[PDB]
Nucleic acid binder design. Structure first.
Lengths: 217, 87, 162, 140, 128
RNA sequence: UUACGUGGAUAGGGGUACGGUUUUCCACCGUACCGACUAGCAGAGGGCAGUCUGGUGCCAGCAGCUGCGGUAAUUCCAGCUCUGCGAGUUUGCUCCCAUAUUGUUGCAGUUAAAACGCCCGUAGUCUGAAUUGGCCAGCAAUGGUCGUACGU
RNA sequence: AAGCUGAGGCGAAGGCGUCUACCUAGAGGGUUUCUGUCGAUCAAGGGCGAGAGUAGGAGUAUCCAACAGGAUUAGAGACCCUGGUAGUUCCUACCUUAAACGAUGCCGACAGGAGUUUGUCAUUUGUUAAUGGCAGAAUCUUUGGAGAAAUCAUAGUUCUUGGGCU
């Protein structure tokens, strides 16, 4: 019969009461099911195993080996997610990490020089740092292509920036850090307060209290 | 943010905290959106609410209490409470 | 004196870059992978010139003379339409646009050759001319004005000799 | 912070920079010169007469005897060990021939398993080993 | 020792804006008063009160809450119009906002003013 | 199973004249007639296309680095297939980038290498506030008003 | 110079504990005294500098490098035991080093609560106390930021990179 929604949010989506990802993001609600994000962007988003790695706990019998793994969800319009997962099997790790990406999912965008049409780069330079690694995403003029490491480029393309500049620092072999600090950089793009998000608009209705009677009776 | 020939671009606008005035991102799940019932004189509800917002920064410190005093008395939902007295 | 027309790529054995460059060679019917890299390097001198112009003021003496002169030279080559003739659109453009203006490909569009490869053969064997002037060279770059004037040189096609 | 930043303070910055270059080992190696007292003499390729044939063996864990010839050089009249690549090849070289020597390709230092020697034999008798090993040229 | 004021004071204003205060207490001067005035024109700040004490002075800022950093760089580097559009690319994060306060011959004004007036000079810092 | 006896086409490499060409040859640029020999170099564990079959058995050897070889070699020595770049392509030494590992922009110094044992102190670098403005029309350049402070 | 003796005080650091008189220095507080930028940091250069060590006198109780025995051990040049001179104390010249350690250079600003505690002043009769001020000394924390992490109200305000010197 397909997935049965559990929790308040899945319930709205199965119902179809709320349409689009933005409504969820604006209200800052926890996405606790992957069956949500499969539904809303249910077309373009693609799984991409970034890498696998072996990992070794010592024990009294020698070396219980487990496989750590990354995947990365990427709609080409301005969304991204990233998840990591260990398991004993390789398939359980990958099919785990696919789900963890969806649980965590909007990348802000803007123009380099003049406002032209349809934005293609980070609004302002931003750096996300995980552990040793430092990632810097820099404003960049049109038709430059993206430049980074091929680890970072795959994730960036999913984000959808047409052209970008980059400046890595620290111990960039450690790829689980390097990809995360890229993901964390794109998280910081909405944090940075510009002149454009001045004014106050009216606060939108939070979609539980709006639909608080279809939910019950 | 604006395309400049015309139009408006970008999807979604983060709501802004009333205390601090910073942006509320997607993932700060400590963010809060209140409803407070405005009432007719003699305490009759009018079916019309004020929606007060806070970011997860302001709650984390302690101070989101004291903002609710300041913001409500500005809108006209309390008397006393804000401004004096200790001793 | 002299100059280096093509540049070698930064990293040799990247999968995505090599897999990209075959299906530019395949579509436009091309000899080597270096005959891309010159057209990449030709696109660089256009865009590096353009960007510097962009940084300058919107009124400066350098921008007015150069900006009009730059767009004039690209409207010849037939990359920019008159819709897009506004200086920022120079920072766009791909190798796929600039490859399309070459003689090989303009024969094909014309269809005289009948194939991308056939077009190369026609030009390399002295069959094709441009306004009564023979062109042995298979990368001419035609200026839209003269695109109409692509035609058989004479020999086997006109002469009919064995 | 941690340096002079002021407007007139360019003598302090320029002169302190000259000191800190002497910590850097590449500036130190170039400048000392310091390179002249070398068998190569700073030349990539050198030639001269073979003295004989020697078996020098690898360190660890690699158990193997490598076969490097002793060669007197032309210009210095020094002597130095020099590796002979490819299997056979020690048999191709002959006793008391002229040979062209070049570097191990490690920009100095000692390369693989093989300690001591920093030198490989490129040619013998004006021919080249690759041609000889492959056998598209000859020796009398 | 107080090496610089304009350098020092803009640190204290930034530490208020990170924290999210309503007002700040800065010894005052005539460059600090002009630096605050120029960012008041672009509406990054509220509106402030330069009080007397027959002394150096004090300022009480009123913060609007729309401001990320005030730098004040030193030493005070000379800059001249053709040379300037490097110092935009280094100092600011973006291209599309944030201004570079420099004391032109006419007075201290943004880069956007300074190129209009056609007068460069020594630079004080920035804001964004 | 669209690249692995047919079907015809079109060259220039080359050859032979003559016309141009140059002080003279050569070679070029033409014109006409003759026509069914032209690819290597470097690799195929990872950094950065085979777990093929055969020989070798910590031996020969490869290998910048990590590593391979002790009789089952995905790295040796050969064959076959495949890959790269292509009239080019490896190999030495010097040298710049990679390198914010020379740091003005722009590094680091509690424990990883790195804060003089402490105080005085000259050269050196650094040095709080203050001096002719306010007000109106602003889009600026500026132009008015308030203040008259009345020297050469 | 026991006990009093403590995450207590003073001193530039090294360091400083019985009591009395003597000469001497200064930090902090208070100040409707005076001067008016006289300042910050520092190559050279100058002094102070635990304990050991050296030279020459005066001491020589205790403890004690060396040394001498006695045990133990396969051996024991050691650990354990019994004796022991140089040193350990004072005075005059030296030496100039330590895990001389907060392994954290100096001056300046700002950024969070909480109660300890030392000095001193202020308003109160909660006067060997209560609340508050400057200056110290530590601490705690469900606070923010930083860091590779351990952790840190400074190791915070740093790819959102520039207060001043070594």
């Amino acid at each position: 019969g397909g997935w049965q929604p559990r929790t308040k949010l899945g319930r709205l989506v199965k119902s179809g009461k709320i349409k689009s990802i933005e409504e969820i993001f604006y209200h800052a609600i926890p996405i606790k099911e992957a069956e949500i994000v499969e539904h809303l962007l249910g077309e373009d988003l693609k799984d991409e195993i970034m890498k696998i790695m072996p990992v070794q706990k010592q024990t009294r019998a020698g070396q219980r080996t487990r496989f750590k793994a990354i995947a990365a969800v990427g709609d080409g319009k301005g969304h991204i997610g990233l998840g990591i997962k260990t398991a004993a099997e390789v398939a359980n790790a990958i099919k785990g990490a696919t789900i963890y990406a969806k649980l965590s999912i909007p990348v802000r965008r803007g123009y380099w020089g003049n406002k032209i049409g349809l934005p293609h780069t980070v609004p302002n330079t931003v750096t996300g740092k995980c552990g040793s690694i430092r990632m810097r995403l820099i404003p960049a003029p049109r038709g430059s292509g993206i430049v980074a490491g091929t680890a970072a480029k795959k994730l960036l393309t999913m984000a959808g920036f047409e052209d970008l500049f980059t400046s890595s620092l620290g111990h960039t072999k450690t790829t689980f850090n390097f990809l995360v600090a890229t993901y964390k950089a794109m998280e910081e793009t909405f944090k940075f307060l510009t002149p454009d998000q001045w004014e106050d608009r009216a606060f939108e209705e939070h979609p539980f209290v709006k639909n608080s009677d279809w939910l019950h009776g | 943010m604006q395309n400049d020939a015309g139009e408006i671009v970008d999807m979604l606008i983060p709501r802004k905290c009333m205390a601090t005035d910073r942006l509320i991102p997607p993932h700060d799940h400590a963010s809060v959106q209140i409803q407070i019932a405005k009432v007719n004189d003699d305490g009759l509800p009018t079916g019309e609410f004020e929606t007060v917002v806070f970011s997860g920064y302001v709650r984390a410190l302690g101070e989101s209490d004291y903002a609710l005093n300041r913001i409500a008395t500005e809108k006209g939902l309390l008397t006393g409470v804000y401004r004096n007295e200790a001793h | 004196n002299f100059s280096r027309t093509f540049k070698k790529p930064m990293r040799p054995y990247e999968k995505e870059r090599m897999h990209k460059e075959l299906q530019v060679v395949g579509e436009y019917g091309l000899k080597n992978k270096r005959e891309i890299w010159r057209v990449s390097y030709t696109l660089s001198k256009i865009r590096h010139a353009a960007r510097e112009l962009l940084t300058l003021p919107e009124n400066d003496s350098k921008r007015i003379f150069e900006g009009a002169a730059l767009l004039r030279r690209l409207t010849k080559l037939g990359v920019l339409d008159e819709s897009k003739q506004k200086l920022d659109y120079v920072l766009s453009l791909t190798v796929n646009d600039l490859m399309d203006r070459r003689l090989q490909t303009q024969v094909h569009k014309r269809a005289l050759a009948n194939s991308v490869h056939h077009a190369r053969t026609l030009v390399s064997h002295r069959h094709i001319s441009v306004e009564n002037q023979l062109v042995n060279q298979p990368a001419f770059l035609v200026w839209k004005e003269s695109e109409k004037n692509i035609k058989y040189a004479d020999t086997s096609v006109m002469t009919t000799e064995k | 912070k941690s340096k002079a930043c002021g407007r007139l303070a360019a003598r302090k910055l320029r002169l302190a920079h000259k000191s800190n270059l002497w910590a850097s080992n590449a500036y130190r190696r170039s400048l000392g010169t310091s390179i002249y007292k070398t068998p190569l003499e700073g030349t990539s390729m050198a030639s001269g007469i073979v003295v004989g044939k020697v078996a020098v063996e690898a360190k660890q864990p690699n158990s193997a005897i490598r076969k490097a010839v002793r060669v007197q050089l032309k210009k210095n009249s020094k002597v130095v060990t020099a590796f002979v690549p490819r299997d056979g090849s020690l048999r191709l070289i002959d006793d008391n021939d002229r040979v062209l020597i070049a570097g191990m390709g490690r920009s100095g230092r000692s390369v693989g398993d093989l300690p001591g020697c920093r030198f490989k034999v490129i040619k013998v008798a004006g021919f080249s080993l690759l041609a000889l090993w492959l056998g598209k040229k000859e020796k009398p | 020792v107080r090496t610089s004021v304009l350098a020092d004071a803009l640190k204290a204003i930034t530490n208020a804006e990170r924290r999210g205060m309503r007002q700040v207490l800065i010894p005052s001067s005539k460059v600090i008063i002009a630096f605050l005035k120029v960012m008041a024109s672009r509406n990054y700040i509220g509106d402030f009160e330069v009080i007397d004490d027959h002394r150096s002075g004090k300022i009480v800022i009123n913060l609007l809450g729309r401001l990320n950093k005030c730098v004040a760089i030193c030493p005070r580097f000379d800059v001249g119009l053709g040379d300037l559009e490097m110092w935009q690319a280094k100092l600011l994060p973006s291209r599309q906002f944030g201004y570079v306060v420099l004391s032109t011959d006419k007075g201290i004004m943004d880069h956007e003013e300074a190129r209009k007036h056609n007068a460069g000079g020594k630079i004080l810092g920035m804001f964004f």
